[PDB]
Design an enzyme around this catalytic site. Structure first.
Site, PDB file in Angstrom:
ATOM      1  N   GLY A   1       0.868  -1.174   0.000  1.00 49.71           N
ATOM      2  CA  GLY A   1       0.000   0.000   0.000  1.00 49.71           C
ATOM      3  C   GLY A   1       0.901   1.219   0.000  1.00 49.71           C
ATOM      4  O   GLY A   1       1.586   1.473  -1.004  1.00 49.71           O
TER       5      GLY A   1
ATOM      6  N   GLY B   1       0.067   1.582   4.558  1.00 44.99           N
ATOM      7  CA  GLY B   1      -0.374   0.246   5.012  1.00 44.99           C
ATOM      8  C   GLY B   1       0.135  -1.014   4.328  1.00 44.99           C
ATOM      9  O   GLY B   1       0.508  -0.967   3.164  1.00 44.99           O
TER      10      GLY B   1
ATOM     11  N   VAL C   1      -0.452  -5.487   4.095  1.00 43.81           N
ATOM     12  CA  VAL C   1      -1.547  -6.451   4.186  1.00 43.81           C
ATOM     13  C   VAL C   1      -1.123  -7.883   4.600  1.00 43.81           C
ATOM     14  O   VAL C   1      -0.094  -8.394   4.142  1.00 43.81           O
ATOM     15  CB  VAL C   1      -2.431  -6.416   2.906  1.00 43.81           C
ATOM     16  CG1 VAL C   1      -3.674  -7.286   3.079  1.00 43.81           C
ATOM     17  CG2 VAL C   1      -2.879  -4.976   2.598  1.00 43.81           C
TER      18      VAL C   1
ATOM     19  N   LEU D   1     -10.582 -12.711   1.110  1.00 44.94           N
ATOM     20  CA  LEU D   1     -10.814 -13.320  -0.173  1.00 44.94           C
ATOM     21  C   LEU D   1      -9.464 -13.805  -0.709  1.00 44.94           C
ATOM     22  O   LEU D   1      -8.398 -13.390  -0.258  1.00 44.94           O
ATOM     23  CB  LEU D   1     -11.464 -12.336  -1.122  1.00 44.94           C
ATOM     24  CG  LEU D   1     -12.973 -12.103  -1.051  1.00 44.94           C
ATOM     25  CD1 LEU D   1     -13.308 -10.928  -0.155  1.00 44.94           C
ATOM     26  CD2 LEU D   1     -13.436 -11.784  -2.456  1.00 44.94           C
TER      27      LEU D   1
ATOM     28  N   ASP E   1      -6.329 -11.310  -5.677  1.00 51.36           N
ATOM     29  CA  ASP E   1      -6.828 -10.113  -6.357  1.00 51.36           C
ATOM     30  C   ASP E   1      -6.922 -10.391  -7.857  1.00 51.36           C
ATOM     31  O   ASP E   1      -6.314 -11.373  -8.343  1.00 51.36           O
ATOM     32  CB  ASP E   1      -5.995  -8.846  -6.044  1.00 51.36           C
ATOM     33  CG  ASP E   1      -4.564  -8.889  -6.608  1.00 51.36           C
ATOM     34  OD1 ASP E   1      -4.287  -9.555  -7.629  1.00 51.36           O
ATOM     35  OD2 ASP E   1      -3.695  -8.193  -6.047  1.00 51.36           O
TER      36      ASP E   1
ATOM     37  N   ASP F   1     -10.021   4.474  -7.368  1.00 52.91           N
ATOM     38  CA  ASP F   1      -8.784   3.750  -7.608  1.00 52.91           C
ATOM     39  C   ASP F   1      -9.070   2.287  -7.986  1.00 52.91           C
ATOM     40  O   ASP F   1      -8.540   1.337  -7.372  1.00 52.91           O
ATOM     41  CB  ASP F   1      -7.824   3.926  -6.415  1.00 52.91           C
ATOM     42  CG  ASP F   1      -6.397   3.470  -6.723  1.00 52.91           C
ATOM     43  OD1 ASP F   1      -5.747   3.890  -7.717  1.00 52.91           O
ATOM     44  OD2 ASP F   1      -5.893   2.663  -5.937  1.00 52.91           O
TER      45      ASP F   1
ATOM     46  N   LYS G   1      -8.725  -0.867 -10.177  1.00 60.00           N
ATOM     47  CA  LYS G   1      -7.695  -1.439 -10.975  1.00 60.00           C
ATOM     48  C   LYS G   1      -7.689  -2.811 -10.448  1.00 60.00           C
ATOM     49  O   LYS G   1      -8.154  -3.040  -9.337  1.00 60.00           O
ATOM     50  CB  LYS G   1      -6.357  -0.768 -10.736  1.00 60.00           C
ATOM     51  CG  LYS G   1      -6.006  -0.567  -9.356  1.00 60.00           C
ATOM     52  CD  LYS G   1      -4.722   0.240  -9.281  1.00 60.00           C
ATOM     53  CE  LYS G   1      -4.186   0.183  -7.853  1.00 60.00           C
ATOM     54  NZ  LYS G   1      -2.974   0.975  -7.635  1.00 60.00           N
ATOM     55  N   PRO G   2      -7.216  -3.755 -11.252  1.00 59.91           N
ATOM     56  CA  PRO G   2      -7.316  -5.122 -10.795  1.00 59.91           C
ATOM     57  C   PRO G   2      -6.596  -5.453  -9.492  1.00 59.91           C
ATOM     58  O   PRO G   2      -7.012  -6.395  -8.861  1.00 59.91           O
ATOM     59  CB  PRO G   2      -6.739  -5.892 -11.957  1.00 59.91           C
ATOM     60  CG  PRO G   2      -6.934  -4.943 -13.157  1.00 59.91           C
ATOM     61  CD  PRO G   2      -6.644  -3.647 -12.606  1.00 59.91           C
ATOM     62  N   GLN G   3      -5.540  -4.747  -9.074  1.00 60.50           N
ATOM     63  CA  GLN G   3      -4.895  -5.158  -7.809  1.00 60.50           C
ATOM     64  C   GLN G   3      -5.767  -4.829  -6.589  1.00 60.50           C
ATOM     65  O   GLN G   3      -5.567  -5.380  -5.473  1.00 60.50           O
ATOM     66  CB  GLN G   3      -3.436  -4.693  -7.619  1.00 60.50           C
ATOM     67  CG  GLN G   3      -3.101  -3.354  -8.185  1.00 60.50           C
ATOM     68  CD  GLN G   3      -2.820  -3.410  -9.684  1.00 60.50           C
ATOM     69  OE1 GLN G   3      -3.717  -3.238 -10.523  1.00 60.50           O
ATOM     70  NE2 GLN G   3      -1.573  -3.672 -10.019  1.00 60.50           N
TER      71      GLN G   3
HETATM   72  C1  LIG Z   1      -1.081  -9.498  -4.221  1.00 63.81           C
HETATM   73  N1  LIG Z   1      -1.318 -10.751  -3.574  1.00 63.81           N
HETATM   74  S1  LIG Z   1      -2.684 -11.575  -3.721  1.00 63.81           S
HETATM   75  O1  LIG Z   1      -3.270 -11.311  -5.006  1.00 63.81           O
HETATM   76  O2  LIG Z   1      -2.411 -12.979  -3.597  1.00 63.81           O
HETATM   77  C2  LIG Z   1      -3.815 -11.081  -2.469  1.00 63.81           C
HETATM   78  C3  LIG Z   1      -3.980  -9.707  -2.350  1.00 63.81           C
HETATM   79  C4  LIG Z   1      -4.873  -9.223  -1.405  1.00 63.81           C
HETATM   80  C5  LIG Z   1      -5.594 -10.093  -0.596  1.00 63.81           C
HETATM   81  C6  LIG Z   1      -6.542  -9.400   0.336  1.00 63.81           C
HETATM   82  C7  LIG Z   1      -7.451  -9.926   1.246  1.00 63.81           C
HETATM   83  C8  LIG Z   1      -8.130  -8.846   1.802  1.00 63.81           C
HETATM   84  C9  LIG Z   1      -7.630  -7.672   1.244  1.00 63.81           C
HETATM   85  C10 LIG Z   1      -8.049  -6.280   1.541  1.00 63.81           C
HETATM   86  C11 LIG Z   1      -7.506  -5.209   0.943  1.00 63.81           C
HETATM   87  S2  LIG Z   1      -6.307  -5.227  -0.208  1.00 63.81           S
HETATM   88  C12 LIG Z   1      -6.206  -3.579  -0.392  1.00 63.81           C
HETATM   89  N2  LIG Z   1      -5.423  -2.945  -1.165  1.00 63.81           N
HETATM   90  N3  LIG Z   1      -7.109  -3.027   0.414  1.00 63.81           N
HETATM   91  C13 LIG Z   1      -7.825  -3.870   1.154  1.00 63.81           C
HETATM   92  O3  LIG Z   1      -8.686  -3.443   1.917  1.00 63.81           O
HETATM   93  O4  LIG Z   1      -6.655  -8.036   0.357  1.00 63.81           O
HETATM   94  C14 LIG Z   1      -5.429 -11.471  -0.725  1.00 63.81           C
HETATM   95  C15 LIG Z   1      -4.541 -11.965  -1.677  1.00 63.81           C
END
Ligand SMILES: CNS(=O)(=O)c1ccc(-c2ccc(/C=C3\SC(=N)NC3=O)o2)cc1
Lengths: 258, 296
Positions: free
Chosen positions: B13, B16, B18, B83, B86, B127, B129-131
């Site tokens: 982030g 932040g 994660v 989840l 992403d 914002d 976007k796929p990520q």
């Molecule tokens: C990049 N790694 S990943 O795609 O495997 C992945 C990314 C995020 C999460 C995940 C679970 C919950 C969240 C919440 C997020 S992420 C973000 N930028 N803001 C949130 O609130 O993000 C799980 C796997």
């Protein structure tokens, strides 16, 4: 020209009933009074000017203060620390460039420390449980203006002037919903300036008639006549200025014929 | 924070960081978003104040569910549903296989779901976007990361200029308009919808003007006919090359007729004619929409 006009209006109506502070919390505050609240709100107006904050920011800070004071008892010496931190939060929520904390400490004249304000911000967030997106008079007023033809920004500033006067006087104004005060104010603004009335379109959108607005319209009208006599004059000073077309200087009308 | 067993770091982030976590008592796997407060300088960051307060008001199946805030004086954690991955990581998994059209049609229907909820609760995301887009094993898609979001007003009043990632940023921000509403999240979704189909990004510019020209080459350089008002926007220059509009079977080859139509109304230059999320829902594209799983 929204697409979610009606949806947003409906949501803000549901929301304002839930974000209401309790009418008579002041009667249960051992150490503070409406009178002290008024000095605080009016001081806030001044801070708003000095740091050129949006009027919404001011409306939200008053929301967070009234709500906070419905759950917590506070001492007169700490009252201003609650105001500051409420404004710091409304700043962070609403502003593109919220003032820094230290600048908040600066405008209390070092009445409190950096760490006191920070800690108060925590508390306010806890008591408010982070529910910061409140509906305000402001949010209704901007919606109601969309029904004005051809447009007229003298009516618009005066309506904002009137809605801002409502923040000073817990009594009576807390008895009213933001949508009602905005209704009253707008009607008052129209009538003072162009002699017209609350348009039937707004009767439709809001379900309020002049009949149902009448109670708040009385009070607002009084407040507006007695404006120059008021102990707090910040909002009047603010609205003499050429930004808001000098509306604090228009002659109120003397009668509303209802 | 006693009840959480942090399992692995999953990303980043800026304020932040994660994580994946589990409750040592209920067994629940969550996502923990840590922000640093450093307890002396600035206090609670406003991306966090924004995120938390907006999220509180946006509970909907297609939007991350906020579970909890834990306010350890100098770190702040947010607890989200976990989840599984992403959309970018998914797109990288499959960009060679293709993502099946039924799944695309389904992800888009669901982003239009949760995005229309926002716009009805006066939140702009800003914002997409796929990520920032999350997917679960049962077929669901949810908008996440609301740090950059904001409650808007009717009509609008000039929010942050510096806004939307870049590849996803609508021309009206690129051109420095003073007002911008709910159309900016739509533009992004169009780019999104397109990127799932072709598996390349629709507009991968490397500066703001690059970004603009890539839009122009693909959708034709706009004029007073297709967008009343462009010629007088702050960043408009009459020296813009004049390109013609490509044909969408060329831009998104795998996409059937009803689709290109919708993507097309999603990408309209005029924010006032750009299809809202709610109307986008009742579009022919969505005659018979299913809920497939991701077979990866
Ligand atoms: C990049 N790694 S990943 O795609 O495997 C992945 C990314 C995020 C999460 C995940 C679970 C919950 C969240 C919440 C997020 S992420 C973000 N930028 N803001 C949130 O609130 O993000 C799980 C796997």
């Amino acid at each position: 020209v929204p697409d979610y006009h009606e949806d947003i209006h409906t949501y803000l109506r549901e929301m304002e009933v839930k974000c209401k502070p309790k009418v008579g919390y002041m009667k249960k505050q051992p150490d503070i009074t409406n009178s002290m609240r008024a000095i605080l709100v009016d001081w806030l107006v001044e801070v708003g000017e000095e740091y050129k904050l949006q009027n919404e920011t001011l409306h939200l800070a008053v929301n967070y203060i009234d709500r906070f004071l419905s759950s917590m008892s506070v001492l007169r010496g700490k009252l201003q620390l609650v105001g500051t931190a409420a404004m710091l939060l409304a700043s962070k929520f609403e502003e593109i460039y919220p003032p820094e904390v230290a600048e908040f400490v600066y405008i209390t004249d070092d009445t409190y420390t950096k760490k006191q304000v920070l800690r108060m911000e925590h508390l306010v967030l806890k008591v408010l449980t982070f529910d910061l997106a409140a509906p305000t008079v402001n949010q209704f007023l901007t919606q109601y203006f969309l029904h004005q033809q051809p447009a007229n920004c003298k009516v618009e500033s005066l309506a904002m002037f009137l809605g801002e006067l409502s923040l000073i006087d817990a009594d009576p104004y807390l008895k009213y919903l933001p949508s009602v005060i905005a209704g009253a104010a707008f009607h008052l603004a129209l009538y003072t300036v162009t002699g017209q009335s609350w348009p039937e379109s707004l009767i439709r959108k809001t379900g309020y008639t002049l009949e149902s607005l009448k109670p708040c319209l009385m009070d607002l009208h009084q407040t507006y006549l007695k404006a120059p006599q008021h102990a707090q004059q910040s909002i009047r000073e603010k609205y003499k200025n050429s930004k808001y077309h000098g509306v604090s200087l228009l002659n109120p009308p003397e009668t509303l014929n209802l | 924070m006693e009840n959480f067993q942090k399992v692995e770091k999953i990303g980043e982030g800026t304020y932040g960081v994660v994580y994946k976590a589990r409750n040592k008592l209920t067994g629940e796997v969550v996502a923990l978003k840590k922000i640093r407060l450093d307890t002396e300088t600035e206090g609670v960051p406003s991306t966090a104040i924004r995120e938390i307060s907006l999220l509180k008001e946006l509970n909907h199946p297609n939007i991350v569910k906020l579970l909890d805030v834990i306010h350890t004086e100098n770190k702040l954690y947010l607890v989200f549903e976990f989840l599984h991955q992403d959309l970018k990581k998914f797109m990288d998994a499959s960009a060679l296989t293709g993502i099946p059209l039924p799944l695309i049609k389904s992800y888009l229907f669901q982003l239009l779901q949760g995005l229309a909820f926002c716009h009805s609760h006066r939140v702009l995301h800003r914002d997409l976007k796929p990520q920032n887009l999350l997917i679960n094993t049962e077929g669901a898609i949810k908008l996440a990361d609301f740090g950059l979001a904001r409650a808007f007003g009717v009509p609008v009043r000039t929010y942050t200029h510096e806004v939307v990632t870049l590849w996803y940023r609508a021309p009206e921000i690129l051109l420095g308009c003073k007002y911008y509403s709910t159309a900016v999240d739509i533009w992004s979704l169009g780019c999104i919808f397109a990127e799932m189909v072709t598996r390349r990004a629709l507009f991968p510019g490397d500066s703001e003007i690059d970004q603009l020209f890539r839009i122009f080459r693909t959708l034709g350089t706009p004029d007073e006919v297709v967008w009343p008002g462009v010629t007088s926007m702050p960043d408009y220059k009459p020296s813009f090359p004049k390109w013609a509009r490509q044909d969408f079977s060329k831009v998104v080859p795998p996409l059937d007729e009803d689709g290109r139509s919708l993507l097309s109304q999603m990408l309209h230059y005029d924010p006032n004619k750009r299809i809202s999320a709610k109307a986008a829902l009742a579009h022919p594209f969505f005659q018979d929409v299913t809920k497939p799983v991701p077979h990866l």
